[PDB]
Amino acid sequence: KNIESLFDYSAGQFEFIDHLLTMGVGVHFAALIFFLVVSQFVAPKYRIATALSCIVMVSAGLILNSQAVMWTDAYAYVDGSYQLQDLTFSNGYRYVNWMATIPCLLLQLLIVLNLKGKELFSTATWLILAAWGMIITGYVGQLYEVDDIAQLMIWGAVSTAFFVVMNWIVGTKIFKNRATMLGGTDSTITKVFWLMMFAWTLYPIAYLVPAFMNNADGVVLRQLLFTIADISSKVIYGLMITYIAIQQSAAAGYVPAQQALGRI
Ligand SMILES: *C\C=C(C)/C=C/C=C(C)/C=C/C1=C(C)CCCC1(C)C
Ligand SMILES: CCCCCCCC/C=C\CCCCCCCC(=O)O
Ligand SMILES: CCCCCCCC/C=C\CCCCCCCC(=O)O
Ligand SMILES: [Cl-]
Ligand SMILES: [Cl-]
Numbered sequence: 001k002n003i004e005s006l007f008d009y010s011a012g013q014f015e016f017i018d019h020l021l022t023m024g025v026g027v028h029f030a031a032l033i034f035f036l037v038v039s040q041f042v043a044p045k046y047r048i049a050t051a052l053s054c055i056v057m058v059s060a061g062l063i064l065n066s067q068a069v070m071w072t073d074a075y076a077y078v079d080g081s082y083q084l085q086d087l088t089f090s091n092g093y094r095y096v097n098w099m100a101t102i103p104c105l106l107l108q109l110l111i112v113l114n115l116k117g118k119e120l121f122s123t124a125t126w127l128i129l130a131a132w133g134m135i136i137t138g139y140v141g142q143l144y145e146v147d148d149i150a151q152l153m154i155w156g157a158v159s160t161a162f163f164v165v166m167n168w169i170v171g172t173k174i175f176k177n178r179a180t181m182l183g184g185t186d187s188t189i190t191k192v193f194w195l196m197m198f199a200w201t202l203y204p205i206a207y208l209v210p211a212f213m214n215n216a217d218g219v220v221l222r223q224l225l226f227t228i229a230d231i232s233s234k235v236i237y238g239l240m241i242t243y244i245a246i247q248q249s250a251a252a253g254y255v256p257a258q259q260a261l262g263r264i
Helices: 013-039 047-072 092-111 117-144 149-180 188-209 216-252 255-260
Strands: 075-078 081-086
Touching: 013 047, 013 081, 013 216, 047 216, 075 255, 092 149, 092 188, 092 216, 117 149, 117 188, 149 188, 188 216, 216 255
Parallel strands: none
Antiparallel strands: 075 081
């Protein structure tokens, strides 16, 4: 039902699909390694944000590790090419952990927009249901990527709607509680806000791929777009939650953060 399964790829694409998935495991697990260590140095008010990116790294990490392992469990080499045997690839669990990863990835921002208590809990809840509506509508569209490109369009359309809606609430909180942030970080979160628009338009590109390269290296183009989105949605936004997170630790009195910024 997915467009991976339609294709007898050559050999070079597979190994490169094997290879996207593999450094993608490696890079998050290495990112993981690093949000753990500068945990000493966050004020215990943005500490959960850097800790939302140990969760995120081993979330994107398992799924991408599940997938590569499942990418290779899946295809022998037969009379030229790597062919579906009888154990299927499909990008379906990836939406599923975006059910967990999009959310978790938003509160750390919301934590670094210093949302707290009722307005942390209020903003957090609406971003999540908008994320979910986007995620499940999209999940059901790529369900017809072979069978029904028209609903893929239609369901993609609804999913987009929720995206628009959810960026509007992301940026509305930034571009408004911007000045409550400290450390000099009142600045870097509008900037961060545009990287996280770019990598989030990458998936709905990896999503219209079937209706414009219904072919084998269309499958590769699709997986090209995934790795990059995973790299700066999970990992590079996160590195910045910490830059934004450490600069607020430091500037409010956090002695370990003040001297963490000293030998840099
Ligand atoms: C891997 C980390 C993140 C934050 C990924 C998020 C996923 C999306 C933004 C995907 C969004 C969709 C949209 C915007 C509309 C078409 C359907 C999609 C599910 C691809
Ligand atoms: C095993 C397959 C390849 C995966 C291993 C990759 C080796 C590390 C490569 C870089 C990934 C990004 C690491 C995050 C940087 C943290 C340090 C920093 O802040 O600059
Ligand atoms: C900023 C995120 C970086 C993502 C890095 C992804 C690595 C891929 C980079 C370019 C690939 C170029 C190699 C050409 C592959 C040809 C495809 C094929 O075999 O048919
Ligand atoms: Cl504190
Ligand atoms: Cl993920």
